[PDB]
Amino acid sequence: MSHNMKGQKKRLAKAHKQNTRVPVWVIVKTNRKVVSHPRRRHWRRRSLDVK
Amino acid sequence: MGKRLISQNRGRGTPTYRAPSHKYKADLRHPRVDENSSLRGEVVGIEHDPARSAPIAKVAFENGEELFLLASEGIAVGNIIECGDDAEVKPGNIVPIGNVPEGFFICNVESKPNDGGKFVRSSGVYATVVTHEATRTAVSMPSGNIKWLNPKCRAVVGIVAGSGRVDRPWLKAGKKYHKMKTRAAKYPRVSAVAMNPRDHPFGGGAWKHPGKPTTVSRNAPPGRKVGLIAARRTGMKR
Amino acid sequence: AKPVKGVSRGRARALAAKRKYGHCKGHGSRKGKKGARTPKKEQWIKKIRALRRRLKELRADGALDKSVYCRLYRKAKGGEYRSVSHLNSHLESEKLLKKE
Amino acid sequence: MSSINYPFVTEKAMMLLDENKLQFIVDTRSNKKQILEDVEKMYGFKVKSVRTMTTMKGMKKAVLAFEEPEAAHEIATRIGLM
Amino acid sequence: MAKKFTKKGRISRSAGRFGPRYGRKDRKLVADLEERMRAPHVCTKCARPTVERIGTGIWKCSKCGHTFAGGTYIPYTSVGQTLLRTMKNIAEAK
Amino acid sequence: MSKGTSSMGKRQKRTHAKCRRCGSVSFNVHTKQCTSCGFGKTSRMRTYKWQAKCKY
RNA sequence: UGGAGGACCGUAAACGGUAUUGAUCUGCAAAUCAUUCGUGUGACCUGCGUCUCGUAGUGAAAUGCUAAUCUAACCCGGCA
RNA sequence: GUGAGACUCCCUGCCGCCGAAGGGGCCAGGUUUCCUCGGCAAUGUUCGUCAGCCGAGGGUUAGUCGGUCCUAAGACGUACCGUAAUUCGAGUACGCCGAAAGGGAAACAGGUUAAUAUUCCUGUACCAUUUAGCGUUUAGUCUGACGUCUCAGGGCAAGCCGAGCGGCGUCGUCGCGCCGUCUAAGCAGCGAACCCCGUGGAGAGCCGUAAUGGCGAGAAGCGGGCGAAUCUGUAAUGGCACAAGUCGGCUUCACCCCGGGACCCGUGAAAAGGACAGCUAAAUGUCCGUACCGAGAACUGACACAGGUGCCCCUAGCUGAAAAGGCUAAGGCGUGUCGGAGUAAUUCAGUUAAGGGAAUUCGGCAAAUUAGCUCCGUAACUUCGGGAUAAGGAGUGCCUGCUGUGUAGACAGCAGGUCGCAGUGACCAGGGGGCUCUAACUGUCUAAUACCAACAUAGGAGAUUGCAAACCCGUAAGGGCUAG
Numbered sequence A: 001m002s003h004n005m006k007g008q009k010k011r012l013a014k015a016h017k018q019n020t021r022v023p024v025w026v027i028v029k030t031n032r033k034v035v036s037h038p039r040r041r042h043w044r045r046r047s048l049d050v051k
Numbered sequence B: 001m002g003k004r005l006i007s008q009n010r011g012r013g014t015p016t017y018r019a020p021s022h023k024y025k026a027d028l029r030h031p032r033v034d035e036n037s038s039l040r041g042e043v044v045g046i047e048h049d050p051a052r053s054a055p056i057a058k059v060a061f062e063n064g065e066e067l068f069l070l071a072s073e074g075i076a077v078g079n080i081i082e083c084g085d086d087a088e089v090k091p092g093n094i095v096p097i098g099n100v101p102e103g104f105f106i107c108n109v110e111s112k113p114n115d116g117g118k119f120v121r122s123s124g125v126y127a128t129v130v131t132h133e134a135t136r137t138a139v140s141m142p143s144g145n146i147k148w149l150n151p152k153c154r155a156v157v158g159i160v161a162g163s164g165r166v167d168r169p170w171l172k173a174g175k176k177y178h179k180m181k182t183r184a185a186k187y188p189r190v191s192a193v194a195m196n197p198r199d200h201p202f203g204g205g206a207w208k209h210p211g212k213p214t215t216v217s218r219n220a221p222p223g224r225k226v227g228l229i230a231a232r233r234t235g236m237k238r
Numbered sequence C: 001a002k003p004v005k006g007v008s009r010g011r012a013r014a015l016a017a018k019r020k021y022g023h024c025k026g027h028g029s030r031k032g033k034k035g036a037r038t039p040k041k042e043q044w045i046k047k048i049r050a051l052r053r054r055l056k057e058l059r060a061d062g063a064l065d066k067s068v069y070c071r072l073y074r075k076a077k078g079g080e081y082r083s084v085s086h087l088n089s090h091l092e093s094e095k096l097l098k099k100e
Numbered sequence D: 001m002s003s004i005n006y007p008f009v010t011e012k013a014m015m016l017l018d019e020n021k022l023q024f025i026v027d028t029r030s031n032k033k034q035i036l037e038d039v040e041k042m043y044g045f046k047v048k049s050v051r052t053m054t055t056m057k058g059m060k061k062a063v064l065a066f067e068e069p070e071a072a073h074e075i076a077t078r079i080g081l082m
Numbered sequence E: 001m002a003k004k005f006t007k008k009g010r011i012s013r014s015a016g017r018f019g020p021r022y023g024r025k026d027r028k029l030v031a032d033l034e035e036r037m038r039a040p041h042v043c044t045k046c047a048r049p050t051v052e053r054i055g056t057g058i059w060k061c062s063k064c065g066h067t068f069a070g071g072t073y074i075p076y077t078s079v080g081q082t083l084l085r086t087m088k089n090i091a092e093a094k
Numbered sequence F: 001m002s003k004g005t006s007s008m009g010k011r012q013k014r015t016h017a018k019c020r021r022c023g024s025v026s027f028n029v030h031t032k033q034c035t036s037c038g039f040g041k042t043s044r045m046r047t048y049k050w051q052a053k054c055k056y
Numbered sequence G: 001u002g003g004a005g006g007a008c009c010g011u012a013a014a015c016g017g018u019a020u021u022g023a024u025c026u027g028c029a030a031a032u033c034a035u036u037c038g039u040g041u042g043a044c045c046u047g048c049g050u051c052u053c054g055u056a057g058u059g060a061a062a063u064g065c066u067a068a069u070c071u072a073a074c075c076c077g078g079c080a
Numbered sequence H: 001g002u003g004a005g006a007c008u009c010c011c012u013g014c015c016g017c018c019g020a021a022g023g024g025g026c027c028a029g030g031u032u033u034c035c036u037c038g039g040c041a042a043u044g045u046u047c048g049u050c051a052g053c054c055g056a057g058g059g060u061u062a063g064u065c066g067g068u069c070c071u072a073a074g075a076c077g078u079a080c081c082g083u084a085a086u087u088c089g090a091g092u093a094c095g096c097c098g099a100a101a102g103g104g105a106a107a108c109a110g111g112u113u114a115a116u117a118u119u120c121c122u123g124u125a126c127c128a129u130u131u132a133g134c135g136u137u138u139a140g141u142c143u144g145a146c147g148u149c150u151c152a153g154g155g156c157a158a159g160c161c162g163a164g165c166g167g168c169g170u171c172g173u174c175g176c177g178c179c180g181u182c183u184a185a186g187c188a189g190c191g192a193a194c195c196c197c198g199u200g201g202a203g204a205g206c207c208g209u210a211a212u213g214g215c216g217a218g219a220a221g222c223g224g225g226c227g228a229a230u231c232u233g234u235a236a237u238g239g240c241a242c243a244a245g246u247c248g249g250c251u252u253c254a255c256c257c258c259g260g261g262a263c264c265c266g267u268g269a270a271a272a273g274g275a276c277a278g279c280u281a282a283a284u285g286u287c288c289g290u291a292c293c294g295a296g297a298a299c300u301g302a303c304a305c306a307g308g309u310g311c312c313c314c315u316a317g318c319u320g321a322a323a324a325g326g327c328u329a330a331g332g333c334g335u336g337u338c339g340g341a342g343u344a345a346u347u348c349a350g351u352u353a354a355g356g357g358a359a360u361u362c363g364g365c366a367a368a369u370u371a372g373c374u375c376c377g378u379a380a381c382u383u384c385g386g387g388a389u390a391a392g393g394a395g396u397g398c399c400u401g402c403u404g405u406g407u408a409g410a411c412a413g414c415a416g417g418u419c420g421c422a423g424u425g426a427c428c429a430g431g432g433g434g435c436u437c438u439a440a441c442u443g444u445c446u447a448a449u450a451c452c453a454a455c456a457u458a459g460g461a462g463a464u465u466g467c468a469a470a471c472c473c474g475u476a477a478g479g480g481c482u483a484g
């Protein structure tokens, strides 16, 4: 239970909501040309450089 | 650049060689007294001085200022310390050394008048008043040298308290270690012959020896003035 | 919730009763040093407190005047008496009690 | 500048209506005083207290207790939740 | 009144806390210093042997509370007493 | 204790925080300076000619 | 009686790292494991904070250590 | 059972693991891993319907818990001055920051969710400021505020015993074993030690302590004041199978209160804040954190890594000196995440081994021996401290009945009977001695081939310097040593 300030937790929240798959409708719209993005990660890996 | 010596490290001011100043009680000096003035104070406590390993006296003066004084032997709680050119020449009083009779023991002696006290401040040491002259007064230092001082230089009458502190042998590295924790001095110390040549002029060699004479010239530059510095002579007296 | 399966202590109770009686406690059962089983300062504390309370009550109830009480108190402090019984025996042999 | 974004309508947030409390998503830059004044001006009901928390979506949620009974139901009906 | 001073025990004195360490010479020095410092010291204010060391160079009388600065291990040194006797002789002569 | 993997378990802290000015995690928490942009040392942006090659 | 000591024994508390020249040696591990060992009220061990650094620092001194790098670290530049 | 599919996912039972850590709490760190549902291409050292994986949705509520406030070592800013100059530099002055383990205003029990709960709800409290009224300084003191070692007294969480009551287990015989028999803050009351005040007058000496001690410079004795932890009541209706819910006793660490002593060439922080004059009412108490892991799978070491961070702080019964080791609770697990089969050599790690007993080998390397406690007894040499557990001998279980010390817990001892090859029966647990070299000793060291005779050390000696010093840093301004 490390203790974050408001901004550190906001940056963690942004990192968390960035770690989502591309929407299926985006894949349909681009005709399978956009299927991923570079901000995918896993929590148990090389950590965030955010906080 | 074969590395700098311990003395150069200390001159640099790194934490390893700095005094733990926050541990100390007071910057011991005489109370400030204007020309042709006096002040009286009473001793309220005798305290341990960590910076000297000798007692200090806490004095409440008439002017409302409380000051730590270098304690002379026999100074007691409730004593009235007088400081001035007209003060009675008694143990614990701060008087000019021109008013001290020959053969009296003084301590905490000013280098110049109103300097605060420079000489004769370690536990048990004292100075003796030898001669009086019109412009100079001479005292015998704890080192044995004769010092010609201004007769207006102030000094507390008596000897410094804590006599015999080093009569007890350390007996043990740990006891001296505990003393050295309150000082700036590095403890313990490696002999120079045990070092490598990059670390000291005496370092290196297949066997331990300086390789050069240990008496060094007074002209030798920093990083070289090691061993017996400008020694008049060496050895035990024949 | 299934019942907690404790640790039954009945056979420890039988052993503790025997040990209270002074059995199952011989030299082949002792493992700690004499001093870890009976610390010496506690022994002295109980001994001297018993002796001092006995002397205080004897001085209070008129069986012992202050002059001999002082000497007996110092003797007890000096380990001259093993217990209260030894002190009473010395009192009765020396006739130091102001009998009436 | 209104601190109130919209009522939070989840299962736990809807469980507040049965205790006369109402949960809002609010501006994270605003505080409890601003939230109270904004809600009291927005719906005209006296607010007993404000509880606020920040989430891992970067939002700020405020739970408002009201003084007048049924005020949470009246606001939830005015908005269209109920 | 004192310890069981055995047939061999009167050498180490208080330096028996060191065991066989530090050599005989320094053990003797420390033992002699302890014997001198633990001795009764008469109070110059009430004249009874109740002066004990309260700290390094600080001495207090257990009876009258008289606290003063003295030697590190001795309440009164010979140099300080020499100063006192010089001043006393001067005061008497006049 | 080995200088390798064992001593690398004590890595539960930081020497550099996120920089207000530039966003780089280069703000030395002891010297109070950003080693990337110079924030906390200068009002200007940290730049050196040796950050590229001699343009010839 | 008392309770001192860089006192003793001793913990798979903690710290260290003797010997097996054992296991392992594309390892569990870019130095670990087992057994066996040293210290364990003190020059003790340790958390967090803080300071001292490149011809400089730090070193109870081995050229040891200064981010798996040390008889002058690392990055970029001089440099193709 | 589920499922298309089951060693591997779920339930019950049996059999196991850890049980002073593999359980509990939480820092840093992680950053959603938490919860629910739906999945199984990859990840998981096998499989998988499972999952810290994949997808979707949800989850963190504070005047009282922290941060926030204070200052510490020590940074940073401005100014001054230096510098060719600066974002560079020491010092000074003024500021300002610097501790989620120092200081510190105040809240508890119960319930509620799938996931939050001293935060939400119920009940019962408390603190701070502002305002209004009612009254006002004692002012500058005290407190905050302190080391190491050792010990007494008092209390208490945990623990244990007996009785009643209520359940469960066992029930071949017996009547035992286990679980429960509860209860917060707040409020009110009492007050041990210390200290102080009034009497008293104590020596061919008296009074005390565990110990040191105290006393005509006023002991004992007698009155008073001040003053703890805790305990008692109230809160007492809350939770409990609306099952009982009532009592006693013992002990008490590793926690709280209180007091004493010893040691120091070592002297053991500061500041905010608080107390000393406040009572009544109303209003206000913003901001940030809060999920979950905290590690043999949530951190770090590229990993679901036998390392490290953290064994950091806690821990029930028996044995036992014990937190050792063993066997068991509670709690956590059968995931230190491949299985089957049972048949060669060889190999890692163990058990045993006739007769011999170091003949092995560079070398007793490795292994074996001894081992707890009590009693007897203990050499050369020695710095008189030690050597020392030297060496070398004897005892030890169980049962029956007792004795002594002690307020007690307990501890020590005796007599008789008795079984085995063996009684510290397992566990745990020195092998010993003699003569040399070397370093006095405890200590330090080549992180990752050298733990040594090397380094250090106390001791001994020499040298410089009287302080605007010696020595040393800086280009300077100015510094270290030096609050000397």
Ligand SMILES: [K+]
Pocket: B003, B004, B005, B006, B009, B199
């Ligand atoms: K050096």
Ligand SMILES: [K+]
Pocket: B189, B190, B191
């Ligand atoms: K040396």
Ligand SMILES: [K+]
Pocket: none
């Ligand atoms: K929690």
Ligand SMILES: [K+]
Pocket: none
């Ligand atoms: K010598």
Ligand SMILES: [Mg+2]
Pocket: B002, B197, B200, B201
């Ligand atoms: Mg050279």
Ligand SMILES: [Mg+2]
Pocket: F003
């Ligand atoms: Mg390295």
Ligand SMILES: [Mg+2]
Pocket: F053, F054, F055, F056
């Ligand atoms: Mg160019």
Ligand SMILES: [Mg+2]
Pocket: G010, G040
């Ligand atoms: Mg040991």
Ligand SMILES: [Mg+2]
Pocket: G079
């Ligand atoms: Mg290059």
Ligand SMILES: [Mg+2]
Pocket: H018, H019
């Ligand atoms: Mg077990």
Ligand SMILES: [Mg+2]
Pocket: none
């Ligand atoms: Mg698979």
Ligand SMILES: [Mg+2]
Pocket: D052, H062
């Ligand atoms: Mg909050």
Ligand SMILES: [Mg+2]
Pocket: none
């Ligand atoms: Mg601050």
Ligand SMILES: [Mg+2]
Pocket: none
């Ligand atoms: Mg197999």
Ligand SMILES: [Mg+2]
Pocket: H439
């Ligand atoms: Mg040695």
Ligand SMILES: [Mg+2]
Pocket: none
């Ligand atoms: Mg040597």
